[PDB]
Design a protein around this ligand. Structure first.
Ligand SMILES: Nc1ncnc2c1ncn2[C@@H]1O[C@H](COP(=O)(O)OP(=O)(O)OP(=O)(O)O)[C@@H](O)[C@H]1O
Ligand SMILES: Nc1ncnc2c1ncn2[C@@H]1O[C@H](COP(=O)(O)OP(=O)(O)O)[C@@H](O)[C@H]1O
Ligand SMILES: [Mg+2]
Ligand SMILES: [Mg+2]
Lengths: 906, 152, 142, 384
């Protein structure tokens, strides 16, 4: 410690701990003496530096602070910061950390404030040489790590940081902002940013992500594209690069409103396309939703090879993943152009082969039938629906369908829903259509109408590739001047195709769904089908839907129910977008009826999703308003008002649901509590609002894919025996369906308890009966994610009919909708050129440890399992590939995605 | 109201229904009950001086992660758990544990095998957690479990 | 419930002892038969500093005095001697020396005599003698 | 690092929940609705002013009960009986009326400080694969502990009863302690943890009541996993020999047999026992069907230690100097707690310096301190 003159190196380390005589007197006196001594100081600069390096290992603040205290003065006292500019500019190298020792390594608010400014200025000027960039570099990649630089070096980077952020907020902007007095433009600091970026990229990741977003421009991300794509293999592995790219997008979502967010995802797509994994390219291009990029990744495998090679099998798989099927239609027609075998390739791109593997899985699963049956009442109507509710997904129950007796013993609308549940027995299958034709060509038109709903459900398995399309059959029934037939026909068309876009389907629904001049309450089905068809792409928010909403208000305002169904359809049509939804929000609001305000608040949910942190408070101020106005005054109408109250509650939960999927993967945790307290607000406020909200609770859980499926629906159930409107129970089971007889062993009993136990009318009893069978399928036949799976961040297209039914009071008519249960996830099985219908092995991981990514990524440890497992849901979602050890290489990665597997054997 | 009220705070009652009148101007603390009844002071290092080497060894491992656990987190080190003081009795083994508690600003809780300190549980096989928990309430603390290892 | 009554009294003692300090009083005198009824805090200095032992062993000059004080009170005969009591046992308590002399004053009345004879005085020693094999005239460890 | 944005996002979800919660409580919790007002009114009309805590000894099925109050006198109390005649049971705390003592109501729950030791508030900051290594004898503890809670569906395909019980045994320091605490973070079901030196007491009669209790609480919450750490401690720890001894130890074991399986048919109590004195246990304890798959742990082998040592040095500062492979060479079938004490003592060398770099020198030096422990309670030098 104490001085021990310069007689050995050990004592020079101690000499500068008390007071250097090599930097304090000498340099100071020299500089304020002759101006030809700059040739002496340049050598004595080197002497100064060594002492920093040696004392850039000593923890204590005092013997770095005090030793260099009078040097901090010399910056302005003797060196003057600039005189003969290069020499005094180059003598800031040792003095710059001196400024930091009082800025950072001591707190005196007066000296910290003033020297923030000074550090920023002298850093800006001294990075023109790039020797300030070199000064940062030796602390970035330290000499021998110690406390000091672990706090000081953050301050260097923060000067540039703050500045770029300040350029958006202020109206003074870079050197006219005096919080830094440095410019972010030029070729003096802009070259300092780039030079810093290369250095901090090599070993770490520090200011690199942070520069991009503070500019706000996709130009910034493209500057990094160049540097990284060289660094992709040699300076660090591909994998590390992939983690860099996705970490930028997923992290900054609440910092990227819709117009910013898409612009950032384009560059990400380009970095992948530069890199080897075309498997990464497809996932991100679907996220953008641009048809062009889908074709581009497909072309990347197709164009190079003049043969079928792994490349064409892989292209077909990449498009197969989307059960929306927007990809499927696109890739089928590229293949005809290229011309190889048609028979295997088009099917494989389409959802046909997914029919095939469901059969392989069914054979293992088995079939179970446990339905009740008693004649003559709502208890008979319930029983016949129940049999299909137990046979959801492709199951074998041929014989039960063949007995047409019970079909006829249902009456009125009951017949329609009876044939509709028959369709779900062969959901996603080429059969069914044979038994259905019987009803379609015989007795009352009601069974003919229910047949069309069942056609849609069965046609989910094949509609892309243009083999057995539902349109071909279903067009005639729309022409037919009967309302039951036409409304049922177009509802099945939307299920059948999916979010797939086809000209004949999409354009069929444009004439009608602008023909809302006709007063018809079952013409809602027109917009509901249209919404499901349209979503899957970055929406243009087509104008036929916008206009037909206005026309319907004009014709009728004494039928609030029809316009309530239709309102939901508008908001879901727009979902899959947030840019264009800002536009239509303002439009709806131009025309103002209190009936119109219902449409506005639902549409606000879609508009702001991507942050939805402004959205949630919006749907709470709205709650305040009715009561607010009444006090202010003091110091036919029926339908419009009833609509007003109901929409507001639906919207609030609706907002929560879109947000938690698009941004978070773990805030799903927080989202439950809002609903408990939110329903509690209403419980102790409007009784009318309570009716909607009970149902909404069940679908909040289902949409977000909450993690605890055991405790929550059941805990709610006991309360909901007392509360009116038993459709709450149906929505709870949508969530619990998860994997069957994992959650659902509790479910049947619990829903059976309130149904058998209580009697409060025979209208209520039906809904309770149905709920139990919906939940269970034999041996966990399938799982439902509302998410696309490919992206858990994606929102569904076929699962939106589950989402749809909570804003409306329960009726037999809504009971017809519920026979549909699509949203399905495929069971992943490894594939080959000859088509293997089983898996080999997989790894699954319940708990990650990574918080540098929202979900982390499964490390190479997982619990190993064998063949023949459906995709595992929450509490099992991270899924790793086990195929490496058998001398096979996966071509199609896995994370918990819906995607099928394919492998290549050496 | 109940938010002005809390566990282990003495109130005033108007005793014909026991209707709460005021909070009391007192509050009991149970950790002081044990510390007092044992009755041990705290110290500085000028009441231990002479084994000054030992003061360095204990300052390193105990005091520095109280004042700055930040350094240990960067280091990635699981902080010291059990620290043995041992030697001939009366060599200031005890007074050094006192001296640190004043400087670390911990409650010096001398445990000695006694149960007179307790009158509400009365054994240490049902007061290990509760002992730890009181030092949690009144944190930080220095739990001087003196095991002589000749008792009985 | 019964033990928590015992303890609540002892706590008050300890606490009143703290208050008692730096006063011109003598802090409490107390005795105990044994040394295994103490609590660690009761024995601790600041409540109890001093530990005045009483040994039974005492030395040759002190057994003399203690026989000698109990002979000051009572009558003896010139035949009786207190110097024949040193040679016998060398670990007695002060109560047993007050005991033998009282026991010899009953044997004296069986003779019907008011002066203690040395016949009386040795017989009384022989009863309640509490013999040792560590004391003089009983040894081969020499 | 670079997780700032997601933590702000989580925080942002927290701001929104705190906000809407607070305002909802404040003034728009509107108790101007009659189903709130009228229910509390006539509920307070029979409900006290002083509520006279009592203790219910037993019930009679004529709408009466006998309470014994802790103040003293018993009473033969009535029951207002809007409180559900059959919902209250011996051991309840009941609210008596300040006038004629009637059961105004019933308190749902009450607790002991002796079950505070049992129950836990913790949420470990370690999750599994901070047990990285020994990764196939840990499929015997997440296929019979974790999995039937996660999927009973798999055990329904085969049918018959699902797994029950494990005993962990092996050398000390080979991870037994952290194994139990790592499945409890995954499963998220009531994790009870009780030390075996508290099951040994210096008072008799209360020994058995403690042991009987653990599983009665455990069954009472439908899922629970009971970690009995150190059931090797029941024959080596004992106080006095006139209220401890053979007798104390025999009884407690006897109790545990009834509890562990016996005839209780209590709730789910998956059991985890750590031990390395497995031959001081009964043959009706280590009997099958209370132990189903039992796990043996021995010291890792050379390539297993490489897995262990890389887990431990990821938390530390590194250099290119550091070489893990030669630290492995020196050790030969030692515990992973020894490896773990080298990395902990390596930063103690860095603490000693007050230099925040960790280097190959720091790991090798603490290696010698670790080997000083093994062979210097030894005094042979070379095997005599
Ligand atoms: N196989 C392993 N894989 C990863 N970490 C390990 C392994 N073995 C030991 N460790 C580390 O060593 C630690 C010390 O272990 P712990 O104290 O839990 O060991 P133990 O075997 O339970 O000791 P005891 O023998 O005293 O019962 C653990 O906390 C753990 O992080
Ligand atoms: N280093 C010291 N400085 C001053 N006093 C000391 C020192 N070491 C021991 N003592 C004295 O010795 C006594 C014994 O101290 P304590 O710490 O209670 O001993 P033990 O090691 O037996 O627990 C006290 O009276 C105390 O003042
Ligand atoms: Mg001591
Ligand atoms: Mg242990």
């Amino acid at each position: 410690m104490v001085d021990e003159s310069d007689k050995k190196q050990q004592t020079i380390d101690e000499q500068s701990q008390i007071s250097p005589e090599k930097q304090t007197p000498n340099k100071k006196d020299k500089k304020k003496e002759e101006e030809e001594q700059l040739s002496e100081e340049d050598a004595k600069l080197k002497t100064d530096l060594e002492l920093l390096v040696e004392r850039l290992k000593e923890d204590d603040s005092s013997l770095y602070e005090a030793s260099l205290n009078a040097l901090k003065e010399s910056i302005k006292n003797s060196t003057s910061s600039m005189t003969a500019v290069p020499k005094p500019l180059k003598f800031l190298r040792p003095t710059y950390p001196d400024l930091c020792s009082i800025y950072d390594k001591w707190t005196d608010p007066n000296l910290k404030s003033s020297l923030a400014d000074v550090l920023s200025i002298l850093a800006m000027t001294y990075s023109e040489n790039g020797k300030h960039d070199s000064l940062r570099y030796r602390l970035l990649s330290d000499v021998s790590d110690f406390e000091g630089w672990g706090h000081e070096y953050i301050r260097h980077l923060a000067l540039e940081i703050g500045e770029v952020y300040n350029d958006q907020v202020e109206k003074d902007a870079e050197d006219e902002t005096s919080s830094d007095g440095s410019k972010s433009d030029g070729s003096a600091a802009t070259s300092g940013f780039e030079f810093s970026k290369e250095d901090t990229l090599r070993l770490c990741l520090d200011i690199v992500p942070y520069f991009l977003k503070h500019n706000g421009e996709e130009d910034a991300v493209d500057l990094l594209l160049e540097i990284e794509s060289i660094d992709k293999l040699p300076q660090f592995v591909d994998e590390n690069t992939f983690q860099r790219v996705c970490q930028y997008m997923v992290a900054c979502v609440p910092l990227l409103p819709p117009p910013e967010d898409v612009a950032f995802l384009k560059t990400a797509y380009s970095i992948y396309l530069s890199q080897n994994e075309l498997t990464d390219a497809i996932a991100l291009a679907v996220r953008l939703g641009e048809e062009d990029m889908i074709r581009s990744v497909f072309d990347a495998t197709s164009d190079p090879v003049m043969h079928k090679q792994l490349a064409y099998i892989l292209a077909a798989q990449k498009t197969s993943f989307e059960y929306e099927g927007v990809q499927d239609i696109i890739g089928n027609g590229k293949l005809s152009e290229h011309f190889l075998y048609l028979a295997k390739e088009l099917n494989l791109t389409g959802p046909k082969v997914p029919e095939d593997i469901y059969k392989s899985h069914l054979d293992n699963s088995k079939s179970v039938f446990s339905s009740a049956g008693l004649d003559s009442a709502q208890q008979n109507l319930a029983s016949s629906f129940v049999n299909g509710f137990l046979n959801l997904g492709y199951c074998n129950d041929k014989l039960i369908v063949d007995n047409d007796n019970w079909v006829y013993k249902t009456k009125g609308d009951g017949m329609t829903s009876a044939v509709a549940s028959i369709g779900s027995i062969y959901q996603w299958n080429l059969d069914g259509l044979q038994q259905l034709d019987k009803y379609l060509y015989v007795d009352e038109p009601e069974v003919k109408a229910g047949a069309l709903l069942g056609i849609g459900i069965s046609a989910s398995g094949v509609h892309d590739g243009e083999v057995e399309p539902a349109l071909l059959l279903l067009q005639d029934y729309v022409t037919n001047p009967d309302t039951k037939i036409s409304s049922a026909a177009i509802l099945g068309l939307g299920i059948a195709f999916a979010g797939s876009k086809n000209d004949e389907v999409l354009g069929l629904l444009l004439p009608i769904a602008a023909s809302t001049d006709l007063p018809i309450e079952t013409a809602a089905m027109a917009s509901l089908a249209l919404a499901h068809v349209f979503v899957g792409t970055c929406n243009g928010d087509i104008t036929t839907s916008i206009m037909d909403n206005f026309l319907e208000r004009t014709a009728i305002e004494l039928k609030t129910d029809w316009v309530r169904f239709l309102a939901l359809a508008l908001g879901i049509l727009y979902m899959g977008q947030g840019e264009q939804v800002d536009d239509v929000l303002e439009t709806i609001s131009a025309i103002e009826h209190p009936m119109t305000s219902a449409i506005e608040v639902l549409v606000g949910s879609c508009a702001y999703t991507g942050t939805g942190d402004v959205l949630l408070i919006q749907d709470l101020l709205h709650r305040l308003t009715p009561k607010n106005v009444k006090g202010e005054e003091d110091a036919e109408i029926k339908s419009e008002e009833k609509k007003g109250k109901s929409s507001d509650k639906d919207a609030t939960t609706d907002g929560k649901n879109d947000d938690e999927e698009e941004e978070k993967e773990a805030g799903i945790v927080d989202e439950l509590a809002y609903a408990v307290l939110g329903i509690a607000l209403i419980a102790l406020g409007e009784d009318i609002g309570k009716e909607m909200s009970l149902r909404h609770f069940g679908h909040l859980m289902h949409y977000g894919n909450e993690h605890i499926r055991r405790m929550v629906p059941l805990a709610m159930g006991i309360v909901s025996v007392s509360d009116p409107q038993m459709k709450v129970f149906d929505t709870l089971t949508r969530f619990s369906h998860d994997a069957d007889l994992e959650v659902s062993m509790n479910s049947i009993f619990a829903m059976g308890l309130c149904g058998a136990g209580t009697n409060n009318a025979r209208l209520a009893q039906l809904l309770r009966q149905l709920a139990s069978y919906y939940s269970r399928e034999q041996d966990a036949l399938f799982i439902t994610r509302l998410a696309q799976g490919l992206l858990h961040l994606g929102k569904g297209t076929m699962t939106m009919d589950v989402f749809n039914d909570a804003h409306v009071l329960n009726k037999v008519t809504l009971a017809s909708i519920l026979t549909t249960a699509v949203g399905l996830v495929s069971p992943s099985f490894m594939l080959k050129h000859h088509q293997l219908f089983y898996m080999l092995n997989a790894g699954i991981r319940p708990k990650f440890i990574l918080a540098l990514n929202d979900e982390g990524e499964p490390i190479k440890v997982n619990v190993r399992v064998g063949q023949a497992v459906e995709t595992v849901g929450q509490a099992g979602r991270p899924k790793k590939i086990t195929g490496w050890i058998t001398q096979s290489t996966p071509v199609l990665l896995n994370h918990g995605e819906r995607a099928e597997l394919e492998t290549d054997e050496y | 109201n109940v938010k002005d009220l809390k566990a282990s705070q003495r109130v005033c009652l108007r005793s014909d229904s026991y209707m709460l009148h005021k909070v009391l101007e007192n509050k009991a603390d149970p950790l002081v009950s044990l510390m007092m009844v044992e009755k041990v002071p705290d110290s500085t290092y000028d009441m231990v001086g002479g084994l000054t080497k030992q003061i360095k060894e204990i300052k390193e491992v105990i005091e520095l992660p109280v004042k700055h656990p930040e350094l240990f987190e960067s280091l990635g080190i699981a902080q010291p758990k059990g620290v043995i003081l041992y030697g001939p009795p009366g060599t200031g083994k005890t007074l050094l544990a006192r001296a640190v508690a004043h400087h670390t600003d911990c409650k010096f809780i001398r445990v000695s095998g006694a149960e007179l300190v307790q009158k509400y549980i009365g054994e240490g096989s049902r007061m290990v957690r509760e002992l730890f928990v009181m030092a949690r309430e009144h944190a930080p603390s220095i739990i001087f479990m003196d095991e002589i290892d000749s008792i009985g | 419930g019964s033990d928590r009554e015992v303890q609540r009294i002892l706590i008050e003692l300890l606490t009143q002892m703290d208050g008692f300090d730096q006063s011109t009083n003598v802090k409490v005198i107390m005795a105990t038969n044994r040394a295994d009824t103490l609590d660690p805090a009761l024995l601790r200095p600041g409540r109890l500093d001093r530990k005045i032992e009483f040994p039974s062993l005492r030395d040759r000059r002190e057994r003399r005095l203690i026989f000698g004080t109990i002979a000051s009170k009572m009558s003896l005969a010139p035949e009786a001697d207190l110097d024949s009591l040193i040679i016998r046992n060398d670990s007695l308590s002060g109560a047993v020396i007050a005991a033998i002399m009282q026991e010899a004053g009953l044997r004296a009345v069986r003779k019907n005599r008011y002066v203690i004879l040395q016949s009386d005085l040795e017989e009384a020693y022989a009863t309640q003698v509490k013999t040792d094999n560590t004391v003089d005239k009983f040894d081969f460890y020499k | 690092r670079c997780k700032l944005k997601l933590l702000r996002m989580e925080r942002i979800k927290d701001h929104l929940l705190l906000e809407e919660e607070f305002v909802s409580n404040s003034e728009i919790l509107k108790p101007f609705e009659k189903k709130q007002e009228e229910e509390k009114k006539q509920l307070e009309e029979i409900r006290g002013n002083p509520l006279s805590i009592g203790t219910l000894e037993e019930i009679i099925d004529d709408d009466h009960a006998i309470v014994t109050s802790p103040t003293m006198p018993d009473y033969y109390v009535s029951i207002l009986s809007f409180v559900d005649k059959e919902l209250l049971e011996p051991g309840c705390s009941v609210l008596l009326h300040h006038k004629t003592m009637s059961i105004v109501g019933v308190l749902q729950d009450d607790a002991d400080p002796m079950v505070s030791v049992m129950k836990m508030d913790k949420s470990p900051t370690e999750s599994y694969s901070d047990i990285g290594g020994l990764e196939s004898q840990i499929q015997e503890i997440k296929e019979s502990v974790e999995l039937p809670l996660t999927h009973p569906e798999l055990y329904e395909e085969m049918g018959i009863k699902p797994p029950k019980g494990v005993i962990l045994y092996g050398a000390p320091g080979t991870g037994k302690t952290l194994l139990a605490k790592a499945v409890a973070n995954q499963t998220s079901a009531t994790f009870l943890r009780i030390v075996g030196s508290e099951l040994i007491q210096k008072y008799l009669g209360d020994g058995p009541r403690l042991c009987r209790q653990i599983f009665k609480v455990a069954g009472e919450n439908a899922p629970s996993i009971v970690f009995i750490d150190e059931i090797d401690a029941i024959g080596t720890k004992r106080y006095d020999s006139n209220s401890g001894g053979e007798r104390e130890i025999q009884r407690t074991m006897l109790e545990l047999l009834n509890q562990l399986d016996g005839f209780d048919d209590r709730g789910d109590v998956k059991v985890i026992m750590a031990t390395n004195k497995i031959e001081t246990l009964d043959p009706a304890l280590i009997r099958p069907g209370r132990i189903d798959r039992k796990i043996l742990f021995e010291n890792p082998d050379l390539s297993t230690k490489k897995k262990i040592l890389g887990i431990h040095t990821s938390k530390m500062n590194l250099s290119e100097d550091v070489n893990l492979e030669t630290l492995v060479t020196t050790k030969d079938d030692l515990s992973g707690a020894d490896i773990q004490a080298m990395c902990t003592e390596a930063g103690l060398l860095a603490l000693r310096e007050r230099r925040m770099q960790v280097t190959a020198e720091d790991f090798k030096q603490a290696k010698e301190r670790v080997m000083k422990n093994k062979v210097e309670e030894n005094l042979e030098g070379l095997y005599l």
